[PDB]
DNA sequence: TCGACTAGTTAAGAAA
DNA sequence: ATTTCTTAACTAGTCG
């Protein structure tokens, strides 16, 4: 039925719905990711070299960045910042900003 | 997901099919107005085109291509059409019986 | 509910 | 990116 994600953290998971998620960062914490929510963000264990390989919606836009497609509210391509629908925002490398 | 790339020079903001009441014709040449929810939105791009995207896209005007899924009400004879949002445009003789 | 005569207005291609 | 020129095609109103 449903598409979620399973967040690890320790003896931790935290399954949140693919389209909660606005986009993932690396943290400052090695081997780990932050996953920005709609309204909170959530560390955890992962790669986003996987994540972006989960779905097409899930797009490599930078080296540190994986954004869901689905909540990007818009682009500006000059800055080459995107906004999502939670009034968030990342960056896109030059090489990467006009595929997204 | 159905979505629509709303172009301005360099920006680009991306709407939901059906956040969209309608569109209509701007004051400056090769301009559209999407009327959102609880906002518009100036844009470049051609009425045909964005009819041609979807059955729900309706050209009920020459100035307006109304989005069918958010149509509250029609008033056939004064040929106004009421949008979900509390707002309205207007529909062209010809083309009022066919929404 | 329909055409149909009028007169004023505009969408969108080209092109700049 | 935004505009100028262009005109076929549109519009509302009227009248029957």
Redesign the interface.
Do not use: F, G, V
């Given at each position: 039925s449903v598409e979620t994600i399973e967040l690890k953290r320790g003896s931790n998971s935290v399954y949140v719905q693919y389209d909660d998620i606005m986009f993932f960062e690396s943290s400052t914490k090695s081997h780990r990711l932050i996953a920005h929510l709609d309204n909170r963000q959530i560390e955890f264990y992962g790669n986003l070299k996987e994540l972006s390989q989960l779905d097409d919606r899930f797009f490599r836009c930078h080296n540190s960045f994986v954004v869901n497609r689905?909540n990007?509210?818009?682009?500006?391509?000059?800055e080459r910042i995107v906004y999502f629908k939670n009034k968030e925002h990342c960056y896109a490398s030059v090489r990467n900003v006009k595929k997204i």
């Open positions: 689905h990007i509210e818009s682009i500006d391509s000059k």
